[PDB]
Amino acid sequence: MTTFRFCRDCNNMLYPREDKENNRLLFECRTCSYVEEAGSPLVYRHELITNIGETAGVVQDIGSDPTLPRSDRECPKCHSRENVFFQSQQRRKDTSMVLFFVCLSCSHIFTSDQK
Amino acid sequence: MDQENERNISRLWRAFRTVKEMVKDRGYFITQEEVELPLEDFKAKYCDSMGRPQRKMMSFQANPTEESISKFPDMGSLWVEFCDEPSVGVKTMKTFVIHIQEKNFQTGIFVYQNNITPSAMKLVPSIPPATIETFNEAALVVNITHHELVPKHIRLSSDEKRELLKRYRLKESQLPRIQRADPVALYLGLKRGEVVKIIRKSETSGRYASYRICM
Amino acid sequence: DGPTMREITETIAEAKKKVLDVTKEAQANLLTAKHGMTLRESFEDNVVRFLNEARDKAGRLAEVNLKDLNNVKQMVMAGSKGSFINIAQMSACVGQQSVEGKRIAFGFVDRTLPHFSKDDYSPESKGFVENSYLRGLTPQEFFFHAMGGREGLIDTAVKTAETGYIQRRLVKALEDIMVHYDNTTRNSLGNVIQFIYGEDGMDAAHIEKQSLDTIGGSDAAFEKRYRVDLLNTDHTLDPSLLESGSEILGDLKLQVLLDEEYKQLVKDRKFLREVFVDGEANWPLPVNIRRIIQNAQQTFHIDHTKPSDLTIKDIVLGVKDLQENLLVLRGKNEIIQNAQRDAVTLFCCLLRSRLATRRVLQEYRLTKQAFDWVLSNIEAQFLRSVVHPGEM
Amino acid sequence: GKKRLDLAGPLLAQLFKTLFKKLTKDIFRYMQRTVEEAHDFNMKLAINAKTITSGLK
Amino acid sequence: LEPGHAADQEQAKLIRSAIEHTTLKSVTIASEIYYDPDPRSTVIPEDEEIIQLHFDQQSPWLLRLELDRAAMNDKDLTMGQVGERIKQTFKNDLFVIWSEDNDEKLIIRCRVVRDHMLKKIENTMLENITLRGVENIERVVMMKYDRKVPSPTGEYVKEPEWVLETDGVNLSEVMTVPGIDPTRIYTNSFIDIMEVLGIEAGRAALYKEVYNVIASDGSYVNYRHMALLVDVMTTQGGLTSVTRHGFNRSNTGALM
Amino acid sequence: THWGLVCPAETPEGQACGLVKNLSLMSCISVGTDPMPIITFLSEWGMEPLEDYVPHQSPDATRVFVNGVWHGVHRNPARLMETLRTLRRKGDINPEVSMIRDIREKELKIFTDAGRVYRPLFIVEDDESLGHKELKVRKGHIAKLMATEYQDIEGGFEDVEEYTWSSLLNEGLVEYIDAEEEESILIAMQPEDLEPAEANEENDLDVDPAKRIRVSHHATTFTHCEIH
Ligand SMILES: [Zn+2]
Ligand SMILES: [Zn+2]
């Protein structure tokens, strides 16, 4: 799940296989017959829910947008009195209403989760 | 493990109580004592020391001569036999049919556990004039007659039906109809052409009587 | 006046402060969601409840402030036109504009209008109107009101068509149902749908809402109001009530009649309790006994002090004759007789409740002629209230 | 912001496009018919002009 | 609920165990397919202690569910019960290892002894399987309602009682659940009532629904009209919808 | 999104309710413009073509869309947006050309087709003389407009050379905003909202009790103002 394995030779991807002979896990391109050591204890992973720490893309020049409201919360890092905040950008009916404050200076993200 | 056995025992006891109540309501002779049989007594009698539910609960009900025989001089004896097999087979139902025929029982009630075989259902309507009725334990766990939304159903004899038709001047088709597969019809064992009487309570009159024909 | 507007403004400000506190609590994830609802649905429900309560309180204050000489108040009190909500919206505050039951949705990206800021959940930005019609509306609440009116117009336009289609189908599906001369409801094919119209055979236009005293009340009150005993202490009949006082004591026929009447009354009470689980006593019934007895009392000039000329035996026999004289089916066989007997059970219960011996000799005191007139009027009204065969 | 309004612009453009295509088809059919004998321009043009005027009206 | 345990809050809390708790979907957070050629040992040390204390017998592929602390809340924690239900729904060689329900996070591991087939068994264990409750039921809401019951003195009084509202409709087996009152159960869907109660009960439920619809706004309609409508629509053994396929498919006159 | 484009009250009753809409006052519809000059301007100012573009090694790139067609990416959307706005306000680009930038989505869409509905709006720019944002239109421009309006009745000798609405558009005081571009701007209802940050707040003041209450302000980054 960390990264889909791609063959160094050619450009295809490496499905996974078992080296029981050496009782090991080896990823195989099975097109050009390229096999490496393939050292990883994870094969597949599925995530049922979505976390809250994803915030947003937080692209630079976020302060250039005038539609984002401004607040006066103190930044934990630089102790500034100016910042912008927005709700979580995950679009579902179960997401909470926690605000993600973004510091225009020092490029810091701090949430309002006082739980 | 033990909780599943206890739940199955309780469900079997409730089904047995419902079967006894249905037999009593159909017009046969069942004392009120055996109807409210305690769970402890049921476990002591119909269950062995190991704890597995033994389906030895076979009873033969006879029609009382006080009212049942007088109203319907054609009712004989009833044979209700529970089955130990989880899913019944064609051969087992053949032995059941032979057992019913040997002592010429007028009607017999068979209760399965999970599902019924279509092959056995094909031969279900055989061996006339004896009628074979099939029931499910899950459907018989609770009694639907005791529900507050289900009014009282009273069967009508041939003379009563003829008198009603003559008095109201109606044909057989000019009556409300109830399906033969209706749960109340199965509970009462209604046959084709049988007229049932329904007594309900209304907000305009104290009592109201309605008649339906099993068609 | 000034103080009333100040109080309304204070109430609105308090509601806005409460909404702001709720929003602040929710934004910190300290809010607890009601079971079966998400963290947003409960918050929205709380917000709309607070806003509606504030609007109702402001409207009630404005209505209270209005004097008795107010023309709108006079129109509302008379009931000719207007209501409390109209006065509230015209004088104190216009209610929050809503779409399909919810607040104004975010038409833009997390915004309702371009003039607001992103992720704004304040009541003003979500479609809550603070001003009244007299004061005037800002452009935002004007737009919200326009959206609400558009929704209303669309709802009316769709509803009229759907209701027309439903009405046409219902009329076409029940156009052949008639009541025949045998008091049975049948279709064109002759199939019987109802063995008696309305399960009682009574015309709808000849039914009035009446209360049954037997079902209601406590056991002690019921016994005090109904039980009458002669050869015993307590619940005794006052001799001055009737001219035959101080002489009916020691009689056996009167005592057995009284106790059998009490047994019938208690059986009727049990039957009514079984029929009506909720205990409701006000039910529509054909003939209004109370109006008849009041008319008889007014037209006969009862002295309410002189002893009555009625007798217990005469009253009981008259009640039984009246009960037997109510015919709805008029049949001779057993089935029709049983149907007629059990199709007037509720009316018999009401008649027994309203014509008890204690009630007649204590509250509604009538003479022999007045009692006969009451019985004849009851019988005539019941006979005239029966449904007419041939009705659609 | 994702919807467009059609004034008396592209509607007349579509009408004129269809009618001009009919014009071209008619003139091409006449040219194909006349390759055997001779050529001239103002016989199919007039009839197809009546067609385009009638269609627009 | 039962008349005896009407105001019993503990009985009400025990009730609502009939809600369908989906398998490893509303309780778990993540799923792992950690590969381990060693049937006994494991690469990570998180569960080495539980493996040590716990101890065709080799499972090269291993499952792992992260679960969540919400298992203790709402429904019972029952760390062993979930794995026991998985075992009794799988059996065969689906050897699983339980957690100790005290080492902070709750981890349940599944192993199969004989990767494409692994996905199929994971899908079966995740999509179509139930632990406890009644199927076709999603949300159950508990609320308190006031019911009028006569007092021992003979007077009607308002007695509060607990009432459960269920989003789903599975009355066929809901009525058989112990601890509830089967003679007072009601469903706004009259379609399912007749198949379990009868035609008359279905007619009564249909009349109740019609009355509720009519009286919602506040208007009053005489009982005779609604009674006639419900009797006409249920003259036969089942519902006769007022449509083309309903009343218009009878033995009446062709012209009509 | 119908604010300022269609009448919220004018609609027929019946089956056509909501389907027939009447254009509001001060509402216009674009006629169309070829996008080739826009493409040339984008290429001249620095804009990598889509052909020689790799998603990796260029994570922070804003896609550029012209009439719904992807043409390439830009490494600094803010500078290009400012240049395009300056060109449009100077009259070099057609005033009816929509230009909307999505900072979060990393997209820059430019529309030059026909059928779009737009309305004029005031332009608010920060002024260092007053220390706060103020309307670009001034009393001098207002006086010139009134002089033009009065002159045409008489035989005026081109006192201000017919200072008309086109002059306002070309000077940069009023610009056209469509529905799509309305999602990236902040609009003040009235010029009274463009007061200093304090705006006489946190101080007790007396106002007319019968006057309609208004919240107003609650912002300091206004980019446009409603004409009326
Ligand atoms: Zn390769
Ligand atoms: Zn900072």
Swiss-Prot record, chain A:
UniProt xrefs under InterPro entries: DNA-dir_RNA_pol-M_15_CS, Rpa12/Rpb9/Rpc10/TFS, Zn_ribbon_RPB9, Zn_ribbon_RPB9_C, Znf_TFIIS
GO molecular function, one term: zinc ion binding
CDD domains associated with the record: Zn-ribbon_RPB9
Keyword check for Transmembrane: no
ZnF (TFIIS-type) intervals: 71-111
Mapped zinc finger ranges (C4-type): 7-32
SMART domains, per the entry: RPOL9, ZnF_C2C2
Record carries keyword Translocase: no
Entry keyword set: DNA damage, DNA repair, DNA-directed RNA polymerase, Metal-binding, Nucleus, Phosphoprotein, Transcription, Zinc, Zinc-finger
Amino acids binding Zn(2+) 2: C75, C78, C103, C106
Modified residues (Phosphoserine): S40
An example Gene Ontology CC term for this record: nucleolus
GO BP, sorted A to Z: maintenance of transcriptional fidelity during transcription elongation by RNA polymerase II; RNA-templated transcription; transcription by RNA polymerase II; transcription elongation by RNA polymerase II; transcription initiation at RNA polymerase II promoter; transcription-coupled nucleotide-excision repair
Positions annotated to bind Zn(2+) 1: C7, C10, C29, C32
UniProt-annotated location(s): Nucleus, Nucleolus
Protein family: Belongs to the archaeal RpoM/eukaryotic RPA12/RPB9/RPC11 RNA polymerase family.
Subunit structure: Component of the RNA polymerase II (Pol II) complex consisting of 12 subunits.
Miscellaneous: Present with 2440 molecules/cell in log phase SD medium.
Protein name: DNA-directed RNA polymerase II subunit RPB9
Organism annotation: Saccharomyces cerevisiae (strain ATCC 204508 / S288c)
Gene name of this polypeptide: RPB9
Curated annotation (Swiss-Prot), chain B:
Organism domain of life: Eukaryota
MF term (GO), any: DNA binding
Disulfide bridge positions per record: none
One GO BP annotation of this record: transcription elongation by RNA polymerase I
Subcellular location as annotated: Nucleus
Coiled coil: none
PROSITE patterns on file: RNA_POL_H_23KD
Keywords: DNA-binding, DNA-directed RNA polymerase, Nucleus, Ribosome biogenesis, Transcription
GO cellular component, one term: RNA polymerase I complex
Functional description taken from the UniProt entry: DNA-dependent RNA polymerases catalyze the transcription of DNA into RNA using the four ribonucleoside triphosphates as substrates. Common component of RNA polymerases I, II and III which synthesize ribosomal RNA precursors, mRNA precursors and many functional non-coding RNAs, and small RNAs, such as 5S rRNA and tRNAs, respectively. Pol II is the central component of the basal RNA polymerase II transcription machinery. RNA polymerase complexes are composed of mobile elements that move relative to each other.
Record-linked NCBIfam families: PRK09570.1 (NF007129)
Known partners and oligomeric status: Component of the RNA polymerase I (Pol I), RNA polymerase II (Pol II) and RNA polymerase III (Pol III) complexes. Component of the RNA polymerase I (Pol I) complex consisting of 14 subunits: RPA135, RPA190, RPC40, RPA14, RPB5, RPO26, RPA43, RPB8, RPA12, RPB10, RPC19, RPC10, RPA49 and RPA34. The complex is composed of a horseshoe-shaped core containing ten subunits (RPA135, RPA190, RPB5, RPO26, RPB8, RPB10, RPC10, RPA12, RPC19 and RPC40) where RPA135 and RPA190 form the DNA-binding cleft.
Gene (name only): RPB5
Curated annotation (Swiss-Prot), chain E:
Complete-protein stretch covered: 1120 to 1398 of 1733
Cited function: DNA-dependent RNA polymerase catalyzes the transcription of DNA into RNA using the four ribonucleoside triphosphates as substrates. Largest and catalytic component of RNA polymerase II which synthesizes mRNA precursors and many functional non-coding RNAs. Forms the polymerase active center together with the second largest subunit. Pol II is the central component of the basal RNA polymerase II transcription machinery. During a transcription cycle, Pol II, general transcription factors and the Mediator complex assemble as the preinitiation complex (PIC) at the promoter.
Subcellular location: Nucleus
Organism of origin: Saccharomyces cerevisiae (strain ATCC 204508 / S288c)
Domain notes: The C-terminal domain (CTD) serves as a platform for assembly of factors that regulate transcription initiation, elongation, termination and mRNA processing.
Assembly mode: Component of the RNA polymerase II (Pol II) complex consisting of 12 subunits. Interacts with DEF1; the interaction is direct and serves to bridge RPB1 to the Elongin complex in a DNA-damaged dependent manner. Interacts with the Elongin subunit ELA1. Interacts with the Elongin subunit ELC1. Interacts with ASK10. Interacts with ESS1. Interacts with RTT103. Interacts with SHE2.
Cross-link (Glycyl lysine isopeptide (Lys-Gly) (interchain with G-Cter in ubiquitin)): K208
Name this polypeptide is given: DNA-directed RNA polymerase II subunit RPB1
Superkingdom to which the source organism belongs: Eukaryota
From Swiss-Prot, chain F:
Localization: Nucleus
Membrane-traversing stretches: none
Family, as annotated: Belongs to the RNA polymerase beta chain family.
Assembly mode: Component of the RNA polymerase II (Pol II) complex consisting of 12 subunits.
Other observations noted: The binding of ribonucleoside triphosphate to the RNA polymerase II transcribing complex probably involves a two-step mechanism. The initial binding seems to occur at the entry (E) site and involves a magnesium ion coordinated by three conserved aspartate residues of the two largest RNA Pol II subunits. Present with 18700 molecules/cell in log phase SD medium.
Job description of the protein: DNA-dependent RNA polymerase catalyzes the transcription of DNA into RNA using the four ribonucleoside triphosphates as substrates. Second largest component of RNA polymerases II which synthesizes mRNA precursors and many functional non-coding RNAs. Proposed to contribute to the polymerase catalytic activity and forms the polymerase active center together with the largest subunit. Pol II is the central component of the basal RNA polymerase II transcription machinery.
Protein name, per record: DNA-directed RNA polymerase II subunit RPB2
The species this protein was found in: Saccharomyces cerevisiae (strain ATCC 204508 / S288c)
Lineage, highest ranks first: Eukaryota, Fungi, Dikarya, Ascomycota, Saccharomycotina
